[PDB]
Amino acid sequence: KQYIISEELISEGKWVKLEKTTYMDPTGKTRTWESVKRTTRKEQTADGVAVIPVLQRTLHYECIVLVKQFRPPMGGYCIEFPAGLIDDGETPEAAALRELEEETGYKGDIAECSPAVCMDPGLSNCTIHIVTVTINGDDAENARPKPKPGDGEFVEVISLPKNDLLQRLDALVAEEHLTVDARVYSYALALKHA
Amino acid sequence: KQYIISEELISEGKWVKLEKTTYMDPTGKTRTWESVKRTTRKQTADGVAVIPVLQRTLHYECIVLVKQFRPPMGGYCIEFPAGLIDDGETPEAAALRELEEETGYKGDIAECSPAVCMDPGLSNCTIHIVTVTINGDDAENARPKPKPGDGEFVEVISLPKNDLLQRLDALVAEEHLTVDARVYSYALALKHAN
Ligand SMILES: O=c1[nH]cnc2ccc(F)cc12
Ligand SMILES: O=c1[nH]cnc2ccc(F)cc12
Ligand SMILES: [Mg+2]
Ligand SMILES: [Mg+2]
Ligand SMILES: [Mg+2]
Ligand SMILES: [Mg+2]
């Protein structure tokens, strides 16, 4: 029984905007909230995709393919699933395969696509689809993968074994100032907890 | 070999601000990024998110989640119990406190992540992911008393760990809720550990 009453623009950049949200609380009292949105969302069912890329190779343990890059908002390097915004008219699956090839060089196969899931719902309306993709690392096309990074894109690939992901992430965090993404960490914790 | 040169305040609310970050790209070219930050960090991270593993003998292990209206999303979200870390509170103490306020359950700390980023292309927001076990057979967890702060209105949803991804997909399809990306990532890895 809660709902939005109004959304007032506070400040609008090229990429991000701040809004004052008025909503009805369950007691029937009007309250406000400071909300972040992207300016880039048209008809996409989500802002972006994140890819869970499972690298599969005969007589190898499965690896989870990750990317390391400088994130200006963090003032530092972050370890994340490959990810990007969905272009206008692009499907989440095409966006996922495209961003995975651009960021890692690998050509994946779709396994499954989540519904739109929320990035930080107390702060922002941002959403992604989480797209699971398998990579046949025995295919010649996946032998010597070269990232195809766009303008102002500078991405390092880190493939870690699924069977040891949390400890391998911990070893990278111990050896440097970097930040692991919360989704990557959540995924690694569940692999341990299973 | 990338770094921050300057941060320009664009707009400062009570809770959130928008900044224009100037940074050095790895080619030696100066570039700008629109960044979001919270105004409330004075802590290891902005917040905590709790993975609450409800353990009851002769029952399936459950993950305890919360459903709340999220003004930025304009709708109801399913999330790990979570909130901001109080000035001079430890992440572990914030985790047990928020779990009790949001669910009424009294838990034990199992493990605590390093600070992990929420949406590092958008914001500098970080949390600690705190794994907590709940002895659902203890008298203190018989009839759990959730203590909502002013303007919090939280429903508790306990789902079985070994079916988590299927149960969340079902809630999305029937209830038109948005699942949190960390919750979804956790659920995926429980299935992928196979
Ligand atoms: O208006 C808000 N925006 C973002 N985070 C918030 C956290 C607490 C609060 F009461 C209000 C807000
Ligand atoms: O300045 C940005 N802020 C947030 N997201 C962005 C996504 C792509 C881009 F080129 C620029 C931005
Ligand atoms: Mg990207
Ligand atoms: Mg990209
Ligand atoms: Mg909360
Ligand atoms: Mg509180």
Side-chain angles (χ1 to χ4, degrees), chain A residues 50-67:
Chain A
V51 186
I52 298 180
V54 181
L55 174 66
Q56 299 172 323
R57 287 178 287 188
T58 60
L59 295 179
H60 298 235
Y61 298 110
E62 285 185 345
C63 292
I64 304 301
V65 177
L66 305 176
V67 287

Side-chain angles (χ1 to χ4, degrees), chain A residues 95-143 145 147 149-165:
Chain A
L97 291 168
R98 171 188 54 74
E99 286 288 345
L100 177 67
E101 185 190 35
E102 286 176 5
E103 292 200 344
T104 76
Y106 288 118
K107 291 182 182 276
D109 309 298
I110 297 292
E112 62 178 317
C113 186
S114 74
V117 294
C118 50
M119 284 311 295
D120 191 359
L123 180 63
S124 76
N125 76 340
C126 302
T127 59
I128 63 167
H129 300 270
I130 301 168
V131 184
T132 303
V133 167
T134 56
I135 301 156
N136 179 358
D138 296 333
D139 196 286
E141 83 192 357
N142 288 320
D151 193 70
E153 251 209 309
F154 311 102
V155 185
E156 177 184 341
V157 179
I158 296 178
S159 299
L160 296 177
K162 177 186 94 183
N163 64 14
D164 198 34
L165 181 63

Side-chain angles (χ1 to χ4, degrees), chain B residues 68 70 82-83 98 102 152:
Chain B
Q68 304 156 250
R70 292 291 198 179
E98 279 297 339
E102 293 198 351
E152 276 182 66

Side-chain angles (χ1 to χ4, degrees), chain B residues 22 48 86 88 152 189 194:
Chain B
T22 300
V48 293
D86 293 334
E152 276 182 66
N194 287 301

Side-chain angles (χ1 to χ4, degrees), chain B residues 4-23:
Chain B
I4 300 302
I5 303 177
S6 57
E7 304 197 291
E8 178 184 3
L9 189 57
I10 297 170
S11 181
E12 179 151 1
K14 172 164 217 279
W15 292 99
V16 184
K17 58 188 177 188
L18 270 37
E19 291 182 353
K20 179 162 271 204
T21 309
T22 300
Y23 69 101

